[PDB]
């Protein structure tokens, strides 16, 4: 449940998503789910080569299982919040 | 060959016993002490049967399972099977909410043997999680539990005072101060010794006010056994800390305080032998 | 008269078992124990890689092989 909570506070914030198959997509985080699926609005190309076969498409759904990385800015995340929350979480 | 055959003969003769008697334990314990370093290979399967008998229904067999741990510990440290030491210790910890007082006493006894020998840092539960589980056991009445616990609590006062926070040691100083109503002696004697261990830990003045409030009480054992503890708190933490608090308490107009403050001063002058001059 | 797989594995306890992963690698040893998820305990395992096959290692003592990767169990090696 923790990372869902994390991703919710990132709504309306630009993020870069790297999928396992070497695809990179920049976009505004419009929506998040429990498995960390993402809906990105106003799609754009970060890398020339890695970026897939789109164009007119400006709104995408990304399957959470397929992501390797979600690149953020240090100002998009309160570290101490994250830390204390991880400390709270139970893993059994 | 006989060293192997002897131990197989004992384990057997240990594990079919019916009546409770000391002879098997002293015997199986006078063998181990003699050959101790040679015992190493035989020490794996023996400890397996202790862990097997601590699961057994008849409560006698759980006594003898734990009674034979208290014997093997000084053998084991020589052996170095510390992981087992931490394996026995946890298994003795999870059993420490047993019903039968005869059995619960002897588990604490084995806990006390593991604790003294082992590195303080190492113990598994560890210590800071153990001690708050004992404080409700001091109120267990009976005796085998009271005695074997008071020796375990006082052990931690010596070896690791810094773990439980001082408000926890004060929860014990009240539970002991109620506990020396007991009819037994060795109880009353060990209860007084562990005020020294607590007074060294936390501080004398927090503890004395607990004791001097108890001299008002009528019943004689309580006033004498507080008067001893004030003597013990004096020796351990120094008489200069105790003495003006006792000389003030002497002013109270009740008579029982005024003897209990004179009796406390008797004890504290024989415990600090030579000092006394100051 | 139904034959249950887990009963078959139960019978091969204390015997030699071959355990074949979904990859080439295999473990041959004495079947000590197993659970409902088909995790397996082996005693003195020979770990193999299969095609010339190179024997990866000779275990001593007890191995817990994750049933997550196990495709086949062969009783008595």
């Amino acid at each position: 449940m923790l990372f869902f909570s994390f991703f919710k506070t990132l709504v309306d914030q630009e993020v870069v998503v790297e999928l396992k198959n070497d695809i990179e997509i920049k976009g505004t985080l419009q929506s998040v789910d429990q498995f960390l699926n993402l809906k990105l609005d106003n799609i754009s190309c970060t890398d020339e080569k890695k970026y897939p076969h789109l164009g007119s498409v400006r709104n995408i759904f990304i399957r959470g299982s397929t992501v390797r990385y979600v690149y953020l800015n240090k100002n998009m995340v309160d570290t101490n919040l994250l830390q204390d929350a991880t400390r709270r979480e139970v893993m059994t | 060959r006989l060293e192997t055959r002897l131990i197989d003969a004992l384990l057997i003769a240990f594990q079919e016993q019916t009546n409770s008697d000391s002879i098997i334990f002293k015997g199986f314990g006078a063998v181990t002490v003699s050959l101790d370093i040679r015992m190493k290979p035989f020490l794996a399967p023996i400890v397996s049967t202790i862990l097997n008998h601590l699961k057994h229904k008849t409560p006698l067999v759980r006594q003898h399972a734990a009674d034979l741990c208290a014997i093997l510990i000084p053998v084991i440290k020589n052996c170095h099977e510390f992981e087992m030491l931490n394996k026995l210790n946890i298994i003795l910890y999870e059993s420490l909410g047993e019903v039968y007082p005869e059995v619960l006493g002897s588990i604490i006894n084995a806990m006390y043997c593991i604790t003294s020998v082992m590195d303080l840092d190492k113990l598994q539960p560890p210590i800071n999680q153990i001690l708050p589980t004992l404080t409700p056991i001091l109120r267990n009445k009976h005796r085998k539990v009271e005695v074997n616990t008071i020796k375990f609590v006082g052990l931690i006062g010596k070896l690791a005072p810094t773990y439980a926070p001082p408000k926890e040691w004060m929860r014990i100083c009240f539970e002991l101060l109620e506990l020396l109503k007991s009819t037994n002696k060795e109880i009353r004697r060990s209860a007084n010794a562990t005020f020294g261990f607590i007074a060294e830990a936390i501080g004398p003045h927090d503890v004395l006010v607990a004791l001097l409030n108890n001299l008002k009480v009528q019943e004689r054992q309580l006033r004498v056994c507080t008067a001893v503890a004030i003597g013990i708190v004096a020796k351990v933490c120094g008489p200069y800390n105790v003495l003006p608090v006792i000389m003030n308490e002497y002013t109270t107009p009740e008579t029982n305080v005024q003897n209990g403050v004179l009796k406390a001063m008797s004890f504290m002058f024989e415990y600090i032998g030579n000092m006394s001059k100051d | 008269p139904e034959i249950l797989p887990l009963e078959v594995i139960d019978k091969t306890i204390n015997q030699k078992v071959l355990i074949v992963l979904q990859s080439n690698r295999e473990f041959e040893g004495t079947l000590v124990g197993f659970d409902d998820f088909v995790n397996v305990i082996l005693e003195d395992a020979v770990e193999w890689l299969i095609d010339r096959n190179e024997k990866v290692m000779q275990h001593h003592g007890r191995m817990l092989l994750s049933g997550n990767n196990i495709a086949i169990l062969v009783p008595g090696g």
Binding site: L19, K20, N21, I23, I25, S31, V32, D33, Q34, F35, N37, L38, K39, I43, P52, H53, L54, S56, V57, R58, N59, I60, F61, I62, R63, T66 | - | -
Partner: protein, 65 residues
């Protein structure tokens, strides 16, 4: 998170193997299992199926064109 806004619309699908599809999305189940109509190969522009069911284990991305 939901593919609700895409129903009955044309969509681009990028598979995990980097393959590309174009189709009308008619149904979706929980795993991103798709029910698709008039499917084509994006690169190939080659007609694949009038009706097809596509497993979510295959999907990496679905885009609303």
């Amino acid at each position: 998170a939901t593919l609700k806004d895409y129903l009955n619309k044309r969509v681009v699908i990028i598979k995990v193997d980097g393959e590309c599809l174009i189709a009308s999305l008619n149904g979706f189940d929980k795993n991103t299992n798709l029910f698709i109509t008039n499917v084509f190969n994006r690169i190939s522009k080659e007609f694949i199926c009038k009706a097809q069911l596509l497993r979510g284990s295959e999907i990496a991305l679905v885009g609303l064109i």
